[PDB]
């Protein structure tokens, strides 16, 4: 902008959306990337592969289309994240994808987080992904227990819209139960 000699960062750098140094290291695997992302309300998992004119998404799952299988709960929590990964994973297996590397973009590797939940989901779906168990939240939290107990300290319903009062991690079970099933329309 200042003059001829001025150096403008690559577009995805200006936009602060792509960590190019991490990306390169990610791509050195030769494997597809399990792109885990988040929004204030949603969680998205994509299986991306390298291409001539840009990346190629071979499969993916959004937390929104989770309801499409019997989900009436919010879509920005642990249970949602895990299931969203699993869904994406299952679809990945469908398209012939068998292995991946976790790309968490600009998110932090915090133990027990959602991008790690998405990973546990995608792994159970049958996808081989380099991981570390003791960095994944314990089972119960994935189910959504941490939120149930939070609702125990009631006095006023945690969820505004009525999905339930004491919430339900048991619903998480029903959904995972439904996804691991063969029938399911992917």
């Amino acid at each position: 902008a200042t003059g001829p000699r001025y150096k403008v960062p690559m577009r995805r750098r200006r936009e602060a959306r792509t960590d190019y140094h991490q990306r390169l290291r990610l791509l050195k695997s030769g494997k597809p990337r399990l792109v885990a992302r988040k929004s204030n309300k949603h969680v998205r998992a994509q299986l991306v592969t390298l291409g001539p004119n840009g990346d190629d998404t071979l499969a993916s799952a959004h937390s929104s289309d989770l309801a499409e299988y019997g989900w009436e709960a919010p879509t920005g929590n642990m249970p949602s994240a895990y299931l969203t990964g699993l869904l994406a994973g299952l679809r990945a297996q469908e398209a012939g994808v068998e292995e991946a590397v976790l790309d968490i973009g600009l998110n932090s590797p915090t133990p027990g987080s959602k991008v790690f939940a998405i990973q546990e989901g995608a792994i159970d779906a049958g996808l081989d992904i380099p991981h570390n168990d003791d960095v994944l939240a314990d089972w119960q939290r994935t189910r959504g227990a941490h939120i149930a107990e939070y609702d125990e300290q009631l006095e006023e319903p945690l969820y505004s819209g009525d999905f339930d009062a004491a919430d339900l991690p048991e619903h998480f079970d029903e959904l995972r139960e439904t996804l691991l099933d063969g029938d399911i329309e992917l």
Binding site: E15, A16, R17, G105, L106, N107, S108
Partner: peptide, 8 residues
């Protein structure tokens, strides 16, 4: 301007 992702 204080967040990590797509800050501005």
């Amino acid at each position: 301007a204080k967040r990590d992702k797509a800050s501005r």
